[PDB]
Design a protein around this nucleic acid. Sequence first.
RNA 1: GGGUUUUUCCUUCGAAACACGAAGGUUUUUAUCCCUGCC
RNA 2: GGCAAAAAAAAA
Lengths: 225, 215
Amino acid sequence: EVQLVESGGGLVQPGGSLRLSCAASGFYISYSSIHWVRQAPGKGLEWVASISPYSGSTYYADSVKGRFTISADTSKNTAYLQMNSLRAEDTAVYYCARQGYRRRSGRGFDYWGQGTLVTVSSASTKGPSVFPLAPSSKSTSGGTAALGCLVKDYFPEPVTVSWNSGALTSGVHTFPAVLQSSGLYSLSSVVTVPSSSLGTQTYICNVNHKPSNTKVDKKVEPKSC
Amino acid sequence: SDIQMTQSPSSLSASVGDRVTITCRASQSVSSAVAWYQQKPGKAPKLLIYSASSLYSGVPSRFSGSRSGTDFTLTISSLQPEDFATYYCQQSYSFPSTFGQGTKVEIKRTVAAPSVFIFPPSDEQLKSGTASVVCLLNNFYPREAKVQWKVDNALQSGNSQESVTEQDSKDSTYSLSSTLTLSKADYEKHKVYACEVTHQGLSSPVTKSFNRGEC
RNA sequence: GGGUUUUUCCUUCGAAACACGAAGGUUUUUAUCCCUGCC
RNA sequence: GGCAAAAAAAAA
């Protein structure tokens, strides 16, 4: 029943400011310690801050105080993280975590949100152009064949892509975006399906890039017979 | 006096049914205030072990911790595919709290040959003038596999980008995309574009390709 | 040594790392406190 | 043997 939801991250310029929020449901934040733990792309986890109950006392990592500040509004059952003087090293996924009950779990973090990505960059946001990559039929492809959508030239991360609007999930592979020499990201997402059923069904991908604020759906077909 | 946690090893690989052990050493006394977390790629960590040795409610019995002074281990008694993850140890004995640098556990399985596909550039993308030949290796193991591009049988270099999914939650395979970035000018220049791969599920390299406009 | 009066320290608990609270613990610093009268 | 007195403050 317990759930935490981070929001408020995204792209910010170096020196900029950001306020992260953490919306708690299923438990009251007044009776636990709440922590922010951050994770850089592909690096490990880094503790950042926390506040403790009743006192309200706060604590920070050395890489972040003077700049970050953790608070909680208990009437909105929400914990915040005010971020000033932002720098490229602050680019990370930021989690908010609940420290479990002492008898039940000691000092462990028993519940985590899913993180909000903060991108500290001087660059400006661009949405992607999604191109389909088409299956190979001979006249039908005897068993199974593959197809996918190319998502090219966007910034920053992330995008989310969904085939038949979440209906098709088996055999999906959305590859990790890699950064072209251009400074834009591009990834591919491919699904495999029985060729038997290739021509009787339509294959759609819903790419979405909330930074850009682009929602495009392109739909894949073979070529001419 | 910031305590430092030293996690051993960084990456390891064992088969299913294997017994695997991760270690962490505290730079100084952290009593028993140490937790272990499982983090699968893309989603958030999950508590496995709190209080150095106690098993958090819901976690399978095969994960276990224990402590010798400042030496903390997390052993997983019988590795399983679902257990591919990155594991982080944490001390919460003092502020600031400190994580280990992590252990990325992969899984050993039988060699699986990649199923290879080639996709020509579609021309909404040559509607705006550049070319997106892409290769696909679906569901294979092991990871280390090389993919060569040619263009009227010309070896290519410095115009290829590859990306490989994480290892699968359930069958342990990988998959990989190699994509060649070139002009519209270089795409009517030549006629056929070959993709070949030398992986050890291949007798010798399987190759797939196409013509320009023959479908 | 035995005490009085004050602090700290430690342990379990209170939704509880500090702060606040409840119940507990057996130690030792003071030419920086008292160890005196009455059948 | 039996009653009575007395008396400030720090630390693990």
